[PDB]
Subunit: 423 residues, 4 copies
């Protein structure tokens, strides 16, 4: 009976040092029933998961920046960062399948993040294909990507579906938050509304079930928005009543005492279900992170923690230049093994085009010459995109075109280009 | 007869200073027969063509940069550039509906170009919604976009469809080139192939017909890659026979004598069927542009020209600081009223992120600080995206939410945000 | 300061027979503040809106079927139906931008509906382009489409965005229903959850404010699932308190007294905020729809109703042939001016393909030739797709190529075709 | 090296009974150089191509229908067809990412075809998912898909790129035709233009290289339109000169003597670089088919052929009902192991909706109840889609939902649904 052999193999897989901490309130029987008859392979997802787990257990910490194009993810890997962050904020702003500029209010189409992850993996694969074609070895391009699944884009089935989509697109890891989908909001926005703790756990179980049904040890990050969230949908859950002042808004939200206490309560509740815990934060406060991490290690020794080094903070207002300089080392040492500047891509794209565009209006081609000279200078450090035809794969596609002809083509592109003759 | 007015009203619109020197080898009765029973209204396109036309005549010249995201487009407009360039090179590298990193060899889906125009206009539309709600109006958001139609992605029927798609999306001008569509290549790549003059003209006719059928006076830009391309597909056209050496390649291609000679032949053929002539060039050489300008102006005095200040040139290697600085004034004088840096969008993005990522790898939040610190300094020039919640409409959608609510609303986004607290 | 002229124009358009007894809890100045500098024209939306309203005021009733491709819509208009239904259920199952087969649980991307409207309006537009070129005009092609906006896919902001999307696509009417977005099911599935009355009203205001913002009088259709829904998110609304039992579920949902009385409570609550009321129903019961009409008209005389002649009912099981044959004429007398078979596309498509497939396995082209004959015979009833090159516009694009070629062209498609030879 | 060992794995995988008599004008080392550093698994494409090969070699022949929705493909598999045809034509008319209705004139976005293969595999994945959850085995859902790549949509790299696209979407075979890509049109349209035989060969080689790089034995079908095509781009190939009259068109096309001898010249040139050969024909003439099967097998013994049972033929005009009944049986014994009704999807869809729309326009719900009854009748033969909630996976998701809850759930959809009361 290969039914009983398959369920056997599911079970053995579940019972390894990965998953040591974690609870699955479903049998292997259940996963078997719901995964169909043919097990599809998700190479980039599996590789990304295994590589992210190992980095997280073998590095001081993993520091990322959000990317909203493949070209950005590419230059992040070229610089030597070992993981890539997929910001829903950045997706709303400038990269969704509605083609709109959106504030972080869950207004964009739900397949936007997965498609971007798929685009980022595609850029990374072309980089690798190009490097491989030149017999280079100096970069491992399949950087784990950690993706924003917001509040699930609805109910647990919506969670289940987006988890599967992120895996198909090949994400190493996926974060889910405890906000009301109908009213999801940026973590550094007012008006945040919590769901019942049991609600947030159902969401996390749907993540893991999805991941199991795809047969990938995708990393589940449980985020909580409870440190600032002074609104709750329902007082039904015994764990949430203690935080309810017993008053109610004209929409019938329950008012709650937000602060590290409600953040810790949610963190503790979610941690048997999550590979990593994320506590949204009003400011960069190394002390608040020490107390949050202390609280969580108190009952969950060595549980991975992630920290948002948000551009949503005015860093040099909240902190002296020495503390900033040490911030990621300090967060490192408390257990925050994954740290990510969420809106790095937006700020990098918007500021960089503003400075070029404004100098261009003023000084025309002087502005562009200066950028091209900055790009040449940066070649000493790894940068190469100044040679933009090679950068995007004109080299690679020329070699394809030559294998297809047999050496006899008058239409080789990189040969006789301004790139080969002026750089 | 209501039909007779419609056929009269088309004709009247053709017989205006807008179409002063340009030939339509088809009749008002034709446009009528092909345009359906209902006149659909393309506001963004009409506005853009009318303003692109008025600007190219009023202003000394109009310099633009390539946008590949809505955000790049909008920061170009905020920095006071009066028009946006849509590079297909850029669509191919990092912004196409296949989600692939591609060289400039028409590998991406043909609807990628227009989807991006819509996306950009969606962003300028949200910027305009924002400024309007705030009673500001110190900026004109609806900058006209000039878009890459490459070589029409195939036959004249393809040219027809991609022009309509671009007008639907709100392009002000579209540019077609005279490369073989199966073998289309960056203009600065080797191994480019010409179609005959009559085929190149069929494409520009199909493009005006598209525009006449939609009822919009869209600027038509005709590009010649003949300045460098030494391959041609047919010896069929009288005007081209003079350039064929007599050699033929193993593929079939007729070899031709490239040079300013061929470009002038092509430009002069195209000039009566286009609004603006763009001679692709292999170095940023002003005498070459002067020679070309006077050649067209000899026959077509006051005909509009376009110069691609290509990042595919190495400006300091090829020019002294004085020329670079004066380059665009020079071109404007010669009659080049639209000057564009095609790959600006690409190099801003890649350079900016390689530089943030690299500094961030060594120095953690100290690097991100310097970007935030620079973003604040940039406000002296009119940069605002440092306050990123407001930049992308958080404030606009609050107003909408409060109007929907009466005013009784607890889930407002911007009030209570770290953005109001710390900025 | 032409502000005051523009605000006056907004106000006047609101005091017309259209929008008689239609409540807007907002001012013309609010609309002015949100709509932006510039007023983009939505020709199909305007036409469709204006036409659908006239049709509901001059016809015994409009009876329509569900469409999930252009071709389907196209043949519905060819058959003489005057309007088109866009089913979210059908989007779910076989026409969504995730390209997944889903049950009706809002598991698909929220832009799938508006995309499908654009595609239909495209097919219809080409049908029109063809007929116009051939000089025919026995069909008016611009049958208004009524589109499913489910429960807004989230909050009032989610509603406002999806309305505007539908208006860009060219919908005449959009329905919203009073289920929770995260728990949205098919109205004939079990375990539906209502939101509070004040919540549904906010969604219907967001809808209108979207329409006002876009200068288009789009039909708004408030749906209620309160006839069958035994759950509710919150007892906050004074108006809902009567229906609550006081039991709450293990998830916190308040049990309520599902039935025509709740359906009626919601209908009367929504009626002043929508042009059309639709009471979902669990069997085709004329007496039921009589009660419901009497109740609404009791307090809102004239109010247009809409009825789902759902395929989710077994029509033979529930009704004799006499009533089935009378059903739509009876509803029309009651004020159900828009009646629609939601899953007509689904059953037509799956049945037809299964039957062809089943026969083709056993009998090969013997089976296909029966269909091919069935199709010729259908020419008695007005079918023409049997000649499938002319059906999709081979002739029309041939007319375009000729105009382009100046009559020339040795590549015409329909000259030489097996269609001219064999049909 | 591990390099030499990977190069070998490639070399060994070619040196097998598949690839039989198949020339690659490149080395395993070439595939290694271009394939990047990781090799991604492609389960559906590998299963599809292994199964297709196996069917084509063990069944008397495979007969398949066109499909333009997953639902159409679903039902094709359920009625018991062993394979699915993806038709570029159908994609043009009612299934393209332009959302346009198009004639078969290569006017749609190239990734349309691959996007539709994804959707269909998804549909079959959810059917399989359902049948597993109900513990059924009677149907094998993973029916191989044969998809249209037209003329590669451009140069050989466009062929490279769409072949990959088709593989990562899970296509089992892809077909390529020797018409000029910019003038590409229906096999049964006039005005077809041939590319040189050397160029047809590059496109096939491009196809094999893509499949080899993704490491999947995708079935390549070479198609020729040289039976009817009387135009050619270049008289350059020495195999093509014989058929040149020496006349030229104004466009510069070479007139050629079209017919079975030209199609046999193309078939014999292409045979060594394809697994299966396809001669496009103007009528369902069994003699023509024997003369082709013969010409080809004379030099390429046991070469698989494909036949288009085209709906572009008026079947009962050209043949007696005796010959029609026996048509696929005969073609089979001649060696035509793949036989497909290209446009079955279009005809099934347009017929069934026109018929219902017309009946519904006259007799209202009497018309719909006749279809539903016709649907119930069909259950005798395996149809089940009349219970439409179970068909699209409401049951499957109810089980997912119940495993996430652990049995404490009041929002189960089939529980209390009209489907479970009336069916
Ligand atoms: Mn987020
Ligand atoms: Mn280009
Ligand atoms: Mn629905
Ligand atoms: Mn085809």
């Amino acid at each position: 009976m290969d039914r009983a052999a398959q369920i056997k193999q599911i079970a053995d897989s579940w019972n390894t040092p990965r998953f040591a901490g974690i609870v699955r309130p479903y049998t292997p029987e259940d996963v078997y029933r719901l995964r169909g008859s043919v097990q599809i392979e998700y190479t980039l997802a599996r590789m990304g998961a295994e590589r992210l787990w190992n980095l997280l257990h073998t590095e001081p910490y993993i520091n990322a920046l959000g990317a909203l194009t493949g070209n950005q993810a590419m230059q992040q890997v070229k610089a030597g960062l070992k993981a890539i962050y997929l910001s829903g904020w950045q997706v709303a702003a400038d990269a969704n399948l509605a083609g709109q500029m959106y504030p972080d209010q869950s207004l964009y189409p739900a397949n936007s993040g997965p498609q971007l992850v798929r685009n980022i993996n595609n850029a990374l694969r072309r980089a690798d294909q190009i490097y491989h074609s030149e017999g280079r070895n100096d970069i491992y391009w399949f950087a784990p990507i950690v993706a924003d699944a917001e509040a699930g884009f609805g109910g647990p089935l919506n969670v289940f579906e987006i988890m599967k989509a992120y895996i198909e697109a090949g994400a190493a890891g996926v974060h889910f938050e405890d906000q009301l989908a109908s009213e999801k909001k940026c973590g550094h926005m007012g008006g945040k509304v919590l769901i019942p703790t049991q609600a947030a756990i159902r969401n996390l179980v749907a993540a893991r079930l999805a991941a199991d049904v795809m047969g990938v040890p995708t990393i589940i990050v449980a985020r909580t928005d409870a440190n600032a969230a002074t609104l709750l949908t329902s007082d039904i859950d015994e764990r949430d009543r203690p935080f309810c002042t017993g008053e109610r808004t004209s929409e019938g939200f329950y008012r709650v005492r937000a602060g590290l206490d409600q953040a810790i309560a949610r963190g503790l509740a979610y941690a048997p279900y999550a590979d990593m815990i994320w506590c949204e934060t009003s400011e960069p406060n190394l002390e608040e992170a020490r107390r949050f991490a202390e609280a969580i290690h108190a009952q969950f020794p060595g549980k991975l923690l992630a920290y948002n080094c948000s551009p949503s903070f005015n860093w040099k207002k909240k902190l002296d230049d020495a503390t900033i300089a040490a911030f990621q080392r300090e967060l490192g040492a408390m257990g925050y093994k994954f740290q990510f500047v969420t809106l790095a891509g937006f700020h990098a794209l918007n500021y960089s085009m503003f400075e070029l565009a404004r100098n261009y209006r003023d000084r025309g081609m002087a502005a562009y010459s200066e950028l091209q000279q900055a790009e040449f200078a940066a070649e000493a450090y790894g940068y190469t995109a100044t040679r933009h035809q090679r950068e995007v794969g004109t080299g690679y596609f020329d070699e394809v075109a030559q294998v297809i002809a047999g050496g006899e083509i008058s239409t080789t592109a990189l040969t006789g280009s301004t790139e080969e003759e002026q750089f």
